[PDB]
């Protein structure tokens, strides 16, 4: 309950760099239909927003500035909006990948033409001759890794949102 | 500097969560011959001991009766040993994945029972005309993703070990 007003800024900075690095890392070509997480280009601007929010509070510890508090609460409102948007998109993406493909979400050419003949949503043996094949096993491993990455991202986003809710007051 | 070492306890806690979560993520059966980082189970114990040290690091930040001075040397030495072991493991694994492996490091059975037929070390069919198959593209994508993960982990481990070395000095 309102422990410290400064030590959380470094945490927010590191989570912002976390989102930026994850967004940069998850740009590898995977299927014609890229995941909705990267098509929107959400992680990069989200992470830059978190890094700016952290830089605005981690190393200031000051008051008696009207502009400072105005910008702080406005950017906190945008941070809440970004957090809820990220939660919604993560839930939609995990439900789309896990359950069944229902959205196209075409992406840019430089991340789509690299792998234009592969699928990462429903890759099951159409014929029994490839029930246990390297292609389907590799796609299953890719899907499992993507599910794990999405779960980790959702957990970290939930923790960060809880931290913000505890720091909004 | 030593003046503001209190704020880094949560940083070390987050680093421990990093080690534990990434160990759990890499625990998945990505090929028969798993990277040496996950076979030795270094990330799990490294993260747990970072968690313990960070919990003790931000206990009181002062001189109690007997609460901090006893650990401030032993746990710092353990953290330094963990950091050097981790960077050694990372620089060994990057070479073992970039160059043909000379360690076996067989994966454990209870995870190998899921996907026991994935080969990354030599995924090149003898047919030169077979290079256009999607299997080769999948193997190349897996190799690129693993290279990116190893590079990011090495960079972040170097950053955390250098900041810890600077703080303890």
């Amino acid at each position: 309950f309102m422990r410290e007003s400064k030590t959380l800024g470094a945490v927010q900075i590191m989570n912002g760099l976390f989102h930026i690095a994850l967004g940069g890392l998850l740009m590898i070509p995977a299927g014609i239909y890229a995941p909705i997480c990267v098509t929107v280009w959400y992680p990069l601007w989200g992470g830059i927003m978190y890094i700016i929010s952290g830089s605005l509070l981690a190393a200031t510890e000051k008051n008696s500035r009207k502009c400072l508090v105005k910008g702080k609460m406005i950017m906190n409102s945008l941070s809440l909006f970004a957090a809820i948007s990220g939660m919604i998109l993560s839930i939609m993406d995990i439900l789309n990948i896990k359950i069944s493909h229902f959205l196209k979400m075409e992406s840019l050419n430089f991340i789509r033409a690299h792998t234009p003949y592969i699928n990462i949503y429903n890759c099951e043996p159409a014929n029994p001759s490839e029930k246990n094949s390297p292609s389907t096993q590799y796609c299953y491993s890719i899907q499992s890794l993507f599910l794990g990455i999405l779960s980790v991202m959702l957990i970290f986003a939930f923790f960060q949102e809880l931290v913000i809710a505890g720091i909004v007051e | 500097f030593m003046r503001e070492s209190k704020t880094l306890g949560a940083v070390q806690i987050m680093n421990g969560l990093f080690h534990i979560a990434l160990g759990g993520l890499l625990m998945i059966p990505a090929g028969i011959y798993a990277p040496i980082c996950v076979t030795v189970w270094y990330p799990l114990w490294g993260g747990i001991m970072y968690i313990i040290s960070g919990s003790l690091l931000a206990a009181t930040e002062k001189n109690s009766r007997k609460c901090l001075v006893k650990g401030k040397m032993i746990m710092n030495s353990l953290s330094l040993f963990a950091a050097i072991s981790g960077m050694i493991l990372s620089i060994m694994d990057i070479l073992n994945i970039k160059i043909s492996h000379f360690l076996k490091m067989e994966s454990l059975n209870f995870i190998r029972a899921h996907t026991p037929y994935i080969n990354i070390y030599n995924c090149e069919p003898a047919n030169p005309s077979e290079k256009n198959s999607p299997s080769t593209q999948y193997c190349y994508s897996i190799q690129s993703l693993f290279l990116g993960i190893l590079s990011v982990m090495l960079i972040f481990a170097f950053f955390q070990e250098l900041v810890i070395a600077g703080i303890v000095e």
Epitope: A126, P128, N132, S133 | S135
Partner: antibody, heavy 116, light 110 residues
Framework: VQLVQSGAEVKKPGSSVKVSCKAS????????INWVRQAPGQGLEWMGR????????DYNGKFKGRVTITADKSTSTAYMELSSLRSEDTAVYYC????????????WGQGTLVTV | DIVMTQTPLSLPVTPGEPASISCRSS???????????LYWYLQKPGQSPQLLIY???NLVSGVPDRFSGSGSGTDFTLKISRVEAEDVGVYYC?????????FGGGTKVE
């Protein structure tokens, strides 16, 4: 890669016959073994398939499960085991190696004919 | 299961002009993936069987150059620009999408 199969054998109705389809020059556990029989009067007819890596097996289901197929990893050779052969079952059997990702049954075998 | 019918059954050999092998599937073979699987076999005495055409889009190396093949999804036709006496034999049409596998009756060409 080379495929060596045993010579033709002459049998009698109601007996049992075994054929050795030796495999060499490739990864025996990285290919699904397919067996196809050819009888006079009509074309080819699939009968069964086996995967020696995990022991998974498939059957045509045309008959009441009379097909019994097993594989040995130590020798990398699959064996034929059929009970109570009949006159109508007199045909030549071929063991073929499959290639994944498009080349379904490009590789064939020498084949072995059985007469009862 | 799945039964295939082909015609003509005999198709006497005549070099150059006449060359047409037709096969059809009774289950309207289509997996909605944009492609349809089809295979062709040649059985001439003297050697073991070999693959000729795979899903009617490309051919294995070493095949005679004057070979082709296409289809629509329900009726499949095989066309040869110039048939020769060297590559004489029977034609087998095959489908592999569900168990059990069934092979065509073949067209005995003499």
């Amino acid at each position: 890669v080379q495929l060596v199969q045993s010579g033709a054998e002459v049998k009698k109705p109601g007996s049992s016959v075994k054929v050795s389809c030796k495999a060499s020059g490739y990864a025996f556990s990285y290919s699904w073994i397919n067996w196809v029989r050819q009888a006079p009067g009509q074309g080819l007819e699939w009968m069964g398939r086996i995967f020696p890596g995990d022991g998974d097996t498939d059957y045509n289901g045309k008959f009441k499960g009379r097909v019994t197929i097993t594989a040995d990893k130590s020798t990398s050779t699959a064996y034929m085991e059929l009970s109570s052969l009949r006159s109508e079952d007199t045909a030549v059997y071929y063991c073929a190696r499959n290639v994944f990702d498009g080349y379904w049954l490009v590789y064939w075998g020498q084949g072995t004919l059985v007469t009862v | 299961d799945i039964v295939m019918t082909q015609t003509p059954l005999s198709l006497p050999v005549t070099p150059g002009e006449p060359a047409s092998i037709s096969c059809r599937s009774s289950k309207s073979l289509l997996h909605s993936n944009g492609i349809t699987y089809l295979y062709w076999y040649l059985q001439k005495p003297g050697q073991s069987p070999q693959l000729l055409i795979y899903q009617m889009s490309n051919l294995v190396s070493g095949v005679p150059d004057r070979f082709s093949g296409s289809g629509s999804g329900t009726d499949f036709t095989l066309k040869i620009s110039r048939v020769e006496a060297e590559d004489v034999g029977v034609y087998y049409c095959a489908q592999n999408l569900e168990l059990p596998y069934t092979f065509g009756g073949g067209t005995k060409v003499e």
